[PDB]
Amino acid sequence: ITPGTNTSNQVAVLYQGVNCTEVNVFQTR
Amino acid sequence: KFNGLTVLPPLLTDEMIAQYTSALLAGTITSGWTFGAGAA
Ligand SMILES: *[C@@H]1O[C@H](CO)[C@@H](O)[C@H](O)[C@H]1NC(C)=O
């Protein structure tokens, strides 16, 4: 998940259908 | 199925789809066609 590289160099990462015990950190559905 | 196959969730939950049908219906009952053409 990217703000666009012109906006910022940060990213967030989604592990699709994975529980956070298996991989800020947040459990989405 | 559990060998390469996955199902992704829809972007809008069924609760959010029901908030849209509610808003369309409540606009239609209170304001006729006018909420399609402009402000209700
Ligand atoms: C993830 O793991 C926790 C602890 O084992 C569990 O309570 C939860 O139901 C699991 N699933 C999701 C989707 O969070």
Radius of gyration of chain A: 12 Å
According to DSSP, the number of beta strands of chain A is 0
**Pairing-aware structural class of the strands and helices of chain A?**
little secondary structure
Quote the beta fraction of chain A.
under 5%
Largest sheet of chain A: none
Shape of chain A: elongated
Largest interface: A-B, 3 and 3 residues
End-to-end distance of chain A, in Å?
16 Å
Heterogens: 2-acetamido-2-deoxy-beta-D-glucopyranose
Helix percent band of chain A: under 10%
Number of helices of chain A: 0
Assembly status: part of a larger assembly
Overview of the molecule:
- The structure is cut from a larger assembly and holds 2 copies of chain A.
- Chain A has 29 residues and is low in regular secondary structure.
- Helices cover 0% and strands 0% of the residues of chain A.
- The radius of gyration of chain A is 12 Å and the shape is elongated.
- The A-B interface holds A 16-17, 29 and B 6, 8-9.
- The structure holds 2-acetamido-2-deoxy-beta-D-glucopyranose (NAG).
- Residues 19, 21, 27 of chain A line the site of 2-acetamido-2-deoxy-beta-D-glucopyranose.
- Chain A: This is Spike protein S1.
- Chain A: Glycans are attached at residues 6, 19.
